[PDB]
From a paper:
FtsZ is an assembling GTPase that plays a key role during bacterial cell division. First, GTP hydrolysis only occurs within the filament, as the complete catalytic site is formed at the interface between adjacent FtsZ monomers. We report a dozen filament structures of the FtsZ core (residues 12 to 316) from the pathogen S. aureus, hereafter SaFtsZ, in complex with various GTP mimetics and metal ions.
This correlates with reduced GTPase activity by about 6-fold in both mutants. The structure of the Q48A mutant shows that its K+ coordination position is occupied by water K2, indicating a role for this residue in securing K+ within the T7 loop for efficient catalysis. Fourth, we found that locking of K+ within the top T7 loop by bottom residue Q48 plays a role in catalysis. K+ is bound weakly and can be evicted from its binding site by subtle changes around the T7 loop, as observed in the structures of mutant Q48A and wild-type SaFtsZ complexed to GMPPCP and Mg2+. While the wild-type protein forms rapidly depolymerizing, single and double, wavy filaments, Q48A and R143K form stabilized, straight, thin filaments that slowly evolve into filamentous ribbons. These properties, which are strikingly similar to the effects of Na+ on wild-type SaFtsZ assembly, suggest that inhibition of GTP hydrolysis favors more rigid, straight SaFtsZ filaments that associate into ribbons.
Residue numbers in the entry: 8 to 315
Amino acid sequence: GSHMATLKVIGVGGGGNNAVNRMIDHGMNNVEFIAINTDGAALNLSKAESKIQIGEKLTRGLGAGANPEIGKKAAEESREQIEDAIQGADMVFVTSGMGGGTGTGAAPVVAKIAKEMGALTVGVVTRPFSFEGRKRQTQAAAGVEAMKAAVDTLIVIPNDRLLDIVDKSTPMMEAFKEADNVLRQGVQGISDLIAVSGEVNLDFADVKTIMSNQGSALMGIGVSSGENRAVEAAKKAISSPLLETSIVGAQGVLMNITGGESLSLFEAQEAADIVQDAADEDVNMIFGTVINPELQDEIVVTVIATGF
Ligand SMILES: Nc1nc2c(ncn2[C@@H]2O[C@H](COP(=O)(O)OP(=O)(O)O)[C@@H](O)[C@H]2O)c(=O)[nH]1
Ligand SMILES: [K+]
């Protein structure tokens, strides 16, 4: 009868595994985590239930030393181990920091395997800070292009955008958590969509329609209360300052609105218009509604945007 979607989040390389570690700390049920690295010492500290050391013959348990070809060969030589860990997933999020050796080279191989295994495959990757220099940025760009060829949808977070949301004292780790929220809240928004039946119900097949073989994507969530809550939640959903791909130009959108018994038709249209006017395109919308009576004055808008 009913379908149960298996979501897996895969961290590849140092930055991706720290995202996984921090997401596990935050708490994420129903999602399964996989940690993939050449660096055996970092893998030893991973909180992920499923750990895969790749490239031990190539690196002797060290990182890739910024050589993406070593990350790529390490992933290819552990293909069977990667397939075994993914097998059964309906959706896979591959998160990695681009510009080093393991993420840049291995993350596109992991994404390709996930897609070959039948999983809807989303990449969420960072680009390096400009202060890391041009060779790092150029390697990262080759990684991004390789990711884009391997995934169904790709979200790119330029680390330079973190400098737009900090003050001179913000701990680096606090900035990194802001970047993690892009992946965490996207995963959580899909999980929630999949676990609850809506009054206007969207399910994993709608996620597939909007994300499959699409390229660049935006995933966002917004929460507001009071008057203008619908407009404010929709603006929050689509307005992250950390994204390379904004909502502008979107041609397909999956939008789900969750609220209490007070959720009004009028405000549902307001939220939908905010998104479609922001896109500045004729948006093919997949619209859903959930009534959670536990919510009183709160409204949550979830947006997945593709078709750029
Ligand atoms: N936002 C963020 N970026 C990171 C993090 N760790 C590393 N990076 C970035 O990701 C790039 C690659 O670093 P790393 O993942 O350790 O390299 P690799 O393990 O050899 O692939 C760096 O050049 C940084 O720009 C992190 O925790 N958060
Ligand atoms: K549903």
